Design a protein around this ligand. Sequence first.
Ligand SMILES: [Mg+2]
Lengths: 191, 195, 139, 56, 175, 50
Amino acid sequence: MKTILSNQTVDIPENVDITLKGRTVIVKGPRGTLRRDFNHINVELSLLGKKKKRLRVDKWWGNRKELATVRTICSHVQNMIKGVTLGFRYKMRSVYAHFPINVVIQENGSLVEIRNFLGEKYIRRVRMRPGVACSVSQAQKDELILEGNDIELVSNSAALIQQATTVKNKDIRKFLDGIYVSEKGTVQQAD
Amino acid sequence: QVLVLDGRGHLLGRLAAIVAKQVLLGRKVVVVRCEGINISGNFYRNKLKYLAFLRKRMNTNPSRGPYHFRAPSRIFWRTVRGMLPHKTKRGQAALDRLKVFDGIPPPYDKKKRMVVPAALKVVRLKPTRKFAYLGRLAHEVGWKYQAVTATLEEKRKEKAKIHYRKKKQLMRLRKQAEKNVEKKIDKYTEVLKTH
Amino acid sequence: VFRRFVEVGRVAYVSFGPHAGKLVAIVDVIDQNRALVDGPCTQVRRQAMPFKCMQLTDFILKFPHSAHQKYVRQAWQKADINTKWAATRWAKKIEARERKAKMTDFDRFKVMKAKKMRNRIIKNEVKKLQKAALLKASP
Amino acid sequence: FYVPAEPKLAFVIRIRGINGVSPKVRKVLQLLRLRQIFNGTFVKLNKASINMLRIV
Amino acid sequence: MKASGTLREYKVVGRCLPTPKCHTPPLYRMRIFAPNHVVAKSRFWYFVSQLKKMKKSSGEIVYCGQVFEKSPLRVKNFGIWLRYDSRSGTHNMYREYRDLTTAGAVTQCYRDMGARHRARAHSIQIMKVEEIAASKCRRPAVKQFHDSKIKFPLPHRVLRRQHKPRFTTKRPNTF
Amino acid sequence: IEPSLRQLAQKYNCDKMICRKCYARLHPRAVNCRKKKCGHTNNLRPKKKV
RNA sequence: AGAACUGGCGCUGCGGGAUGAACCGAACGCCGGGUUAAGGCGCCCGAUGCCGACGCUCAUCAGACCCCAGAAAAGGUGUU
RNA sequence: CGUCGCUUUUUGAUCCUUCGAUGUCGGCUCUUCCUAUCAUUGUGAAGCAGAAUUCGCCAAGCGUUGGAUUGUUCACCCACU
Ligand SMILES: [Mg+2]
């Protein structure tokens, strides 16, 4: 169809300032900084105006699978703004029958060493993506907490725990055992 | 004498068809840094049809038969070979004028290198379509010299910074040197007839 | 990043075709790759040129959306596009490029002699800037 | 509307070859004197004649 | 018909031969698009024979003149009605273009029917072409140019390969 | 057992749709199989409960 | 396997169909210049090295030109 | 109940090649190939609790035996796997 342009905007608050090197995005905020290159996606980025801080992503002509990716840009930027002011906190809980799953933290909140998964002697050490932090929760049974700035590194880390705890050669409609994600929240609350 | 074509950003058959025409016409062409030749279509597709080439093996003894080369200098050289009449002596003599080098050797690192805008990926591929590098599809098939080439590449280019650093120093001088003119009688004819 | 657009009133230069090298003012876009243009003061009249032919300049004109030939003509010479095109460095390059192609054989002699003359003066004087710079760093 | 006279003569050239030709249609070309390719002949246009040019 | 080159609108009239039964036949009129007027007065007998009991033997044409537009400079919206043939059946089709002339928009149709629907020019019958006014268009690709102060740039420009030297030392910027 | 943790386990193991052709394990509001081997077909049945 | 009508092959080279009895052009004394048919014009391989026009299409088995040398029913919120 | 294909490991139909000759069943011996997968690797689905099975997927890397009868291919039986 080759439409005349579309454009999403993203409002930015004051505590975070996006600068752009090009199609690369540099997001500095309160609890750190993180960056992504978007040099594969063929769009122009433009932050407009002082004191209001609006980002204007817009794609000239494009077709329908090229128009699908202008909303993909701004929703990766909105998770870089949320993750640098609030952070990401993926609480997860261990579900178990007869055998309690014993989960400890070996290297400073990076490695997770899971033992006694369903009575197995083979330990499971899962090394996480650099930027996340491991935690046995408090005032709650069998809960693990992951905290980080980047949503694609926390949620990938949250998936490596769940994928390692897979029940094999069994009926998986019973034997519902594993460490599954239970909540998708933030490090700082209510902003 | 000899033309030197830097091979990065180029497509495989779009470059090798032009090189094979020049080499029949008497010229001596040297294609340099053929690790970064591109090829259209995504990586897994180009990887499959090269593995389909590897099993093109004659059954009774594979020592005789198809010689599956793995360095991307010889991946390119074989593409040129199929665009030349190599079973004739006119095309045997053609393939001797072509010397293709992977990386950039020291006879050819201080020459000036040329590109072919017919075969460039930026020119010729539509920007929303996928392409594969000839370097890492050579790596996935038995070419064991990727790391020791890309170490020598960044040693070559750091020495290529320090030459271009002191060359733009010299032309900052001879443009500040021509600030003090004392020669404007000679600017008269060049500005009148394209300086 | 996309600092000049197509627009009603955008002055485009024409690179190739039957009107190669004359300005046009864009009047109306019609469909996706063809634009209705004319230059009334530069001898190219109203017709549909492709966008792939035309070269966008940084001159805009405030005339209505697809007016007549008169109203485009009044916008053209009030803003004085033909003289402001003389005082730009891109028309000095097309001026210089055609001065070099009609450069005759005797002028190619007169170019040659004064070209090697001013390169002797620079090479002997850029040597003197070398000769002083080593004298800065020797103490 | 003035409709002009439909024309009295026609110039006919033979544009196809000689071989692989039906016997009726190589009789009319024998009667039009068009034996090689690219021979021309001026032809009187009549009801009998236009019906020969429909065969050919 | 091959529709070679750009097409060309013709006004063709014609009437059947005056019999001893019927004198002064009604002299019908059509609107033929064809690359030249010999094809045009052949396409007249294709449609008239589909609608009346007339044929080239028992009729003649009495005018074949090129009719062409009263505004070659104004930009117009054309909505046209089609009767092409597909591989399975035949279809009715409405279709909107945007060009400076009637003959250039119907040429733009035959290029498009071959592009989109693979429909060859012998198999598609133009029913009627007329210029339509805006806010009565229904195709949103024609509709998106109805914008006063419309603007866009030209992204990623490519042309002039091998003409400007095959061998240069110069990576050509695409603006 | 812990019946709230019983629900959160079944959200990733039982509450899904199975295709009759590609046999993939999709999500409960799929209409088509995502796998190319079936041609993105639209005959789905729920994953059978115990 | 067996007829009808016409043209071919057999008895016939040549240009194109990579290859070939029969397809498509065209039929042949020995040459020089010109032009074409069928067919083509990235490079083998003469000719688009045209600033050709307009769209459609991404394939983890793409597609690619009469005869002719590989596919159907059914199906796809894949795109038009 | 229909109905659309594929394959050439069966049988036919055909009679193009071979009649101044292409050594004609089976077993033995040995090599390589195919997948339309029995087992093994990784998986998905069950009217999958476990165990045992079945239906699919990437898959031909690697295995797929010892005998009694019969010239037998085939067949059938014993035993291991
Ligand atoms: Mg014929």
